[PDB]
Write a protein that binds this DNA or RNA. Structure first.
Ligand code: CA
Ligand code: CA
Ligand code: CA
Ligand code: CA
Length: 291
DNA sequence: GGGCCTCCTCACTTTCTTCCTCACCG
DNA sequence: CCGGTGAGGAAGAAAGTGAGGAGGCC
């Protein structure tokens, strides 16, 4: 079983709370409602999904294309397990806002209002604030209101951070040919990325870890944040000890382990030698996108 | 025994991850 | 010169979010 705070951190990273409201003339109200918690990952991390499944004793795992796998809970009885966990171990990103709307939608269905016109209206109102909001077909049918409270929580513990890092983390080794010379540049880099909507939370990492900085990235109108640590003494003294104690999950754990081997070589200045570089070069082949 | 629920196959957009380059300073 | 560091941006796919179909529960 996964540590429950590791689980929440991972959920804040890769989870999704979904409210479906579908047209159907076979329903008395004319709409069929479905409430879904979902985690979609690459097949290489199917084991995480299976362990969450056994930990919660709920949910179904299905394939999605040739390289992806998906764990979903939508059975109404089984959804109490989801709410139970996330009440006891609350999300801290803006996704918590989706969970609370998810939660309200559940209360509507629990008293069975989704089977009435008054409830469907309420559900549409809820869905409008969730994720990507109302469809065009749904906006047409329901011209009424277009926002939710901003979530402002701090990092609860390093077990959450471990779960969140197992999702959004990057353990990288940069190599490049120096402009003036024949030497190869070497940089160990740690990274956590997130949409700019959680700028406060991402800023909170500089304080919480006692190192690193934030870089603002964008493509046209799309923008995100990358928390990076490139100070090696910080990585060696602050970053690595954290995840040695608080174990990462999935393939990213393996990436971290190789990453630490590179960190050892760099600690002993062997990245400056010819043979140490090709050892590092060999490790890169084993890790990340190369795994 | 009609709605109603649940689980399947399946697909859209983008938020992540990964990778690359390089000027600067001490 | 040289190595360490931080800042930039490119590429694209592993994510996030959500689609229709339908068997069968109660
Ligand atoms: Ca995420
Ligand atoms: Ca991930
Ligand atoms: Ca992610
Ligand atoms: Ca690439």
């Amino acid at each position: 079983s996964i540590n429950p705070w590791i689980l929440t951190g991972f959920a804040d990273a890769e989870g999704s709370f979904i409210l479906r409201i579908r047209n159907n003339n076979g329903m008395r109200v004319g709409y069929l409602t479905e409430l879904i918690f979902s985690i979609k990952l690459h097949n290489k991390d199917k084991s995480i999904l299976e362990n969450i499944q056994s930990t919660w004793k709920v949910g179904k795992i299905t394939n999605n294309g040739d390289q992806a796998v998906m764990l979903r809970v939508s059975r109404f009885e089984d959804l109490k397990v989801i709410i139970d966990h996330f009440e006891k171990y609350p999300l801290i990103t803006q996704k918590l806002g989706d969970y609370k709307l998810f939660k309200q939608a559940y209360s509507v269905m629990e008293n069975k209002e989704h089977l009435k016109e008054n409830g469907i209206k309420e559900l549409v109102r809820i869905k409008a604030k969730m994720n990507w909001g109302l469809t065009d077909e749904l906006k047409k049918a329901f011209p009424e209101i277009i926002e939710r409270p901003l979530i402002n929580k701090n990092i609860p513990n390093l077990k959450w951070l471990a779960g969140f890092t197992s999702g959004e983390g990057h353990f990288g080794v940069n190599l490049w040919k120096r402009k003036g010379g024949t030497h190869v540049g070497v940089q160990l880099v740690f990274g956590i990325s997130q949409h700019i909507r959680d700028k406060n939370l991402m800023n909170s990492l500089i304080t919480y870890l006692g190192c690193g900085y934030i870089l603002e990235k964008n493509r046209s109108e799309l923008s995100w944040l990358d928390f990076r640590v490139t100070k090696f003494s910080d990585i060696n003294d602050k970053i690595i000890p954290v995840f040695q104690e608080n174990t990462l999950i999935g393939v990213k754990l393996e990436d971290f382990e190789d990453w630490c081997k590179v960190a050892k070589l760099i600690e002993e200045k062997k990245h400056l030698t010819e043979s140490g570089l090709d050892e590092i070069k060999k490790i890169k082949l084993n890790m990340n996108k190369g795994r």
